[PDB]
Every structure is written in structure tokens, then in C-alpha cells.
């Protein structure tokens, strides 16, 4: 980890060639010194001990199939860092250039990725439901966004607060996907989910109900599974964010879209200034309204569209 900054080349999970920032000191390590206090990628070696070994490579070429998840985790963490810095003037997830650490090859056949409070963790998938999860830029940015949330609003991962937490991660993951312009859409995880099946995804922001997630508050899940429905009830907020950006008419309520850039600015302000650990959906509405008011004025179209979007999903 002390060494010379250089640039290697590899291939990602989807077979695309990319340049990655590495560090040389006997080996070439997946350590990018160009962004904050660094981006570090580790090999968990199919175990669950974390973080594992800082990724070392002998020749600075990462074309082995074992390398692919590491290349993508490392590269997409950099892209996400760039988004937050360039678009929102935020230096890493803590606002003070905290090192970003990711471990890949976590466990065996593990169909998930997560932020654990310290670092990102990516399974390889079982090869049927998922391929290695770091192949999805929206997934990577979703996870890194959990770190942002943790250092700002601190939304508890239960019930409505947790659904907001999830939605925020889906929103910014999507916004990062659009920023990188990597075949962007309003779907989540499409690039790594069900390699055997075309056109699906884990979740949809444009139409959450496509996969049985609610798209209206009256359809919210109130049981105890999934921490009280954090990945299920996120669909209500996701639909609202999609409406704010893209517009549409939903359950008879019409929303004029104000586009992705303004969506991002509103939600980022809401997240960093107004939300608290126990914020519920109703408070999110107030926060988003206040945020749009701050940025664009109380008689703006932007404020009107935020109100319409939350009315469309039944959030008062
Ligand atoms: Ca190599
Ligand atoms: Ca996409
Ligand atoms: Ca996507
Ligand atoms: Ca698929
Ligand atoms: Zn999440």
C-alpha cells in the first residue's frame, strides 16, 4: 500500500475492457490513490472473513475470470466517488475523503451485496439468479450510497425509515448509472440478475408493481419480513422519485417531470439536511418539499412536481 500510482487494464464481469488505477510495490495492487484517501479492493477468497487480502496482481493485467468482479468493484467505486464529488461536492461517503473498501468473492454462491457499516461486500452469485454483483454499476452505487446515508441522515434499517434508506440507495444508484451513461434505465440490478433471462431486473423504479412491489402507500407492506419491508416499500418512494424526474400520470394524478439533475439535487439536500434516523415517508415528503423550496422557491414548478409525485403515491 505504499508505492507508485499506475494504471492497469482488465475486463469486467460483462466482458468489457477498462483501465483501473492500481498501485505498484512489488505487486500491482487494487489501490487507487487518485480519489480521496484511496479506493481499495480486497479478495475475500470465498470466505466470510473481512476484508480479506488487498488484491495483488503480478503484471497489472486483470483478464482472468477470477479478476472480473474485482475490476468492476474497483472501477465502479471510482465512478461513484466521481459522481458524488463532481455533482454534489461530496468527498467520499463521509464528506472527508474516507477510504472506500470493497471485498469481492465473498462466501460461495452468495446472491447479495451489501454495505456493512465499514465497507462494501460483493458475492459472486450462484450463476443462475446472479452473476458477480459488482458487475452492476447501479448495485455498486446503491451500496456506496448506504455509506452516504449512514454518515448523514442515519436512517434506521427498519420499517419506513429503512424503506427510505433503500429507496435513496436505488435513486442514487440509478443516478450514477445515468452519470456513467452505461445503458441507463430506471431498473435495478438488470446487468447482473438472471443471466439466463432477458429484460428483467431485481426491482423497477418506473413500475415497481412489475415485480410485485407496491407503487402506492395504500399497498404498503406492514408485516415483519425484510425488516418490515425495506426492499418492498421502497417501491413507493422509487415510483415517486421516478415521477419527479420523468413525469407521468399515476393513479389519476399527473406529474410534470423536472428531470434527473433536479431530482438528485432535491434528494441529496433532503438526505443531508433534513432527514433523521427515524424519518417516515410523510417526513420524507416534507423534507423533499422543503429541499425543492430551498433550491427553487416555494412557487416553483419543482416544488409543485414534488408535491404531485408524493400525492400520486399516496404519501401525505
Ligand atoms: Ca494479472
Ligand atoms: Ca442499465
Ligand atoms: Ca439499472
Ligand atoms: Ca436477467
Ligand atoms: Zn440496500
From Swiss-Prot:
Binding site for Ca(2+) 2: 138, 177, 185, 187, 190
Primary subcellular site in the record, as a coarse category: secreted
Annotated positions binding Ca(2+) 4: 194, 197, 200
Binding residue positions for Ca(2+) 3: 177, 183, 185, 190
Gene Ontology BP annotations: proteolysis
Activity relative to temperature: Thermostable. Retains about 45% of its activity after treatment of 90 degrees Celsius for 30 minutes.
Name this protein carries in UniProt: Thermolysin
Gene that encodes it: nprS
Full-protein interval shown: 236 to 551 of 551
